[PDB]
Amino acid sequence: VIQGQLMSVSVPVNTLVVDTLSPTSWQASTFFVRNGSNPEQDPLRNLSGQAV
């Protein structure tokens, strides 16, 4: 219940590597802004656990 109503304030751009996609799948050539990421955010100067 708690997790279902804590929305993250500021989530950095995701840079996890996923290299086991099928060759056939659409694949990014950059770590572009997606899934609600905030491109302004320095991931090492964040309160990543902060939520509203």
Note whether 9 and 50 are within 8 A (CB).
Answer: yes
Instruction: State in angstroms the smallest separation of the CB of 13 from a copy of itself.
Output: 10
Of the candidates 38, 47, 48, 49, the residue with the CA atom closest to the CA atom of residue 13: 38
Instruction: State in angstroms the smallest separation of the CB of 26 from a copy of itself.
Output: 4
Q: Among residue numbers 10 through 39, which ones bind a copy of itself (CB under 8 A)? A: 10, 12, 14-30, 32-36, 38-39
Q: How far is CA 17 from CA 6, 27, 52, in A?
A: 26, 11, 29
Which residues bind to a copy of itself, rule: CB under 8 A? 1, 3-7, 9-10, 12, 14-30, 32-36, 38-51
